[PDB]
Design a protein around this ligand. Structure first.
Ligand code: HEM
Ligand SMILES: Clc1ccc(-c2cnc[nH]2)cc1
Ligand SMILES: Clc1ccc(-c2cnc[nH]2)cc1
Ligand SMILES: Clc1ccc(-c2cnc[nH]2)cc1
Length: 463
């Protein structure tokens, strides 16, 4: 009944079958041979694998409700412990997500605005960037400090100075925590947590960092409830917290302490590594195609220019910018395996039958590179999102944020985040790196199922 695949080893499953090349080309091969949606047994864990725009969509969109449930990710779970909105299933999920959305958009007025807030951080990014002035520098950390700062602003209410002792001792972790989750002993744990639960090692060390972050969060929440002003709701914490008051009249409501605290935690968990990486890779790309950055730099001017602040109402009158912004995302393909779904009920897909909770990885990477929707699917080439008359050409296969009932909660936030950060830099300061444009290597340093670009250095020559 389950979709077809490679016969597993009875204990490891196919984890041996992977190593052969990349742990994703391994998948490529195990398409027909086996087709477009197959199963693989990771460890002892049966996993369906939607592969390729059409197959992904058909399931995740046209059967969206069935496929909308969140899969197991056992390593970081012992903490997230099934709360908050990445990681909830059930009504809890359909309700926290409902909250979280209403609470942006109607985050404006005020103040501030997510927009104003990103610009505020941008002013700062530029400001901090000007200081080096020709002097080359790995901007992989200020990209992590600017991405992370935004989330702070939203959840905590204010942005930290980069130099800040808490912020730093918090940014590390996050990124180390990330680093650890993406290590061999984590991957093993992910699959055999049942066994390795009981013995020490990086799965604990991971949870201890996250625990720390929580005690900060929970701490900040008191401070928030003390200072709490029902009239001026400072941020997410506040707004939740006041909504929480509202629910005092319900014997059994769903907005309890730990859905707040862990959500806050999750927001960070989502809103940092990825959106920073995409910027790193963004600038790195701009370097290898120094003219694409030029073509944008001219467009930057025509529509904005010398003085004012770059505004969201720009991208609409700037196709290339956004086109580029898309190709940066398509190409860099930063979540390649998507984040685990599982089906809510037994479910009928393409004739096969997946029992309740059968896990399913939407292999989007297969969609950002889908040969059916793009041509030189493997090269960086913005004309992937242009047409002949060089206006935007959106594509049903571009889904870096996933697709359907689950699509990335902070998609908007990031979509904007990229745009401004990208334009507000490229407004001020022209990329120039020691590394020769001829052969910049877009190879990632490593994957750990999370490519990060080979570490790099460029200068920022102003105006
Ligand atoms: C370009 C950078 C980003 C990418 C590529 C990205 C991508 C994704 C993807 C692919 C998913 C999986 C949806 C699924 O399969 O269930 C997701 C989920 C999620 N992401 Fe993002 N994301 C980005 C930035 C952010 C930011 C900035 C935030 C916070 C502001 C965020 C918050 C979330 C949340 C809360 C979920 C859980 C959705 C749910 O199941 O309710 N992400 N993201
Ligand atoms: Cl090249 C390669 C390396 C490691 C794995 C792996 C991770 N977890 C189990 N096996 C697979 C393929
Ligand atoms: Cl385990 C996990 C889940 C979701 C994300 C994410 C969503 N949006 C951006 N990053 C990252 C890591
Ligand atoms: Cl099985 C599995 C799937 C996805 C991840 C991931 C994606 N982004 C960060 N971590 C980790 C482990």
């Amino acid at each position: 009944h389950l979709p077809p695949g490679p016969r597993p080893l009875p204990l490891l499953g196919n984890l041996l079958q992977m190593d052969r090349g990349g742990f994703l080309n391994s998948f490529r091969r195990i398409r027909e041979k086996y087709g477009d949606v197959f199963t693989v047994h990771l460890g002892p864990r049966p996993v369906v694998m939607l592969y390729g725009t059409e197959a992904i969509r058909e399931a995740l969109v046209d059967q969206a409700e069935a496929f909308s449930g969140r899969g197991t990710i056992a390593v970081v779970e012992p903490i997230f412990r099934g709360y908050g909105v990445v990681f909830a299933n059930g009504e809890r999920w359909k309700a926290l997500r409902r909250f979280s959305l209403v609470t942006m958009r109607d985050f404006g007025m005020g103040k501030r605005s997510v927009e104003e807030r990103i610009q505020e951080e941008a002013r700062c990014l530029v400001e901090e960037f000007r200081k080096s002035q020709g002097a080359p520098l790995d901007p992989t950390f200020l990209f992590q400090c600017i991405t992370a700062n935004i989330i702070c602003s939203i959840v905590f209410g204010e942005r930290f100075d980069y130099k800040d002792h808490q912020f730093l001792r918090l940014l590390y972790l996050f990124y180390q925590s990330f680093s650890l989750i993406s290590s061999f002993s984590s991957q093993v744990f992910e699959l055999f947590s049942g066994f390795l639960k009981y013995f020490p090692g990086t799965h604990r060390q991971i949870s201890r960092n996250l625990q720390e972050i929580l005690d900060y969060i929970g701490q900040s929440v008191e401070k928030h409830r003390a200072t709490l002003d029902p009239s001026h709701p400072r941020d997410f914490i506040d707004t939740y917290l006041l909504r929480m008051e509202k629910e005092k009249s319900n014997q059994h409501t769903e907005f309890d302490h730990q859905n707040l605290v862990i959500s806050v935690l999750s927001l960070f968990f989502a809103g940092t590594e990825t959106s920073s990486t995409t910027l790193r890779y963004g600038f790195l790309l701009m370097l290898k195609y120094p003219h694409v950055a030029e073509k944008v730099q001219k467009e930057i001017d025509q529509v904005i220019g010398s003085h004012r602040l770059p505004t969201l109402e720009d991208r609409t009158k700037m196709p290339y910018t956004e086109a580029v912004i898309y190709e940066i995302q398509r190409f860099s393909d930063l979540i390649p395996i998507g984040v685990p779904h599982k089906v809510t009920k037994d479910t009928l897909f393409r004739g096969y039958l997946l029992p309740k909770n059968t896990e399913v990885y939407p292999i989007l990477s297969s969609a950002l590179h889908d040969p059916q929707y793009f041509e030189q699917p493997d090269t960086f080439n913005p004309d992937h999102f242009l047409d002949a008359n060089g206006a935007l050409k959106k594509s049903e296969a571009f889904m870096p944020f996933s697709i359907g009932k689950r699509i990335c909660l902070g998609e908007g936030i990031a979509r904007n985040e990229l745009f401004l950060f990208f334009t507000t830099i490229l407004q001020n300061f022209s990329l120039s790196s020691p590394v020769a444009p001829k052969d910049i290597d877009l190879s990632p340093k490593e994957s750990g199922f999370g490519k990060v670009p080979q570490t790099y250095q460029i200068c920022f020559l102003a105006r």
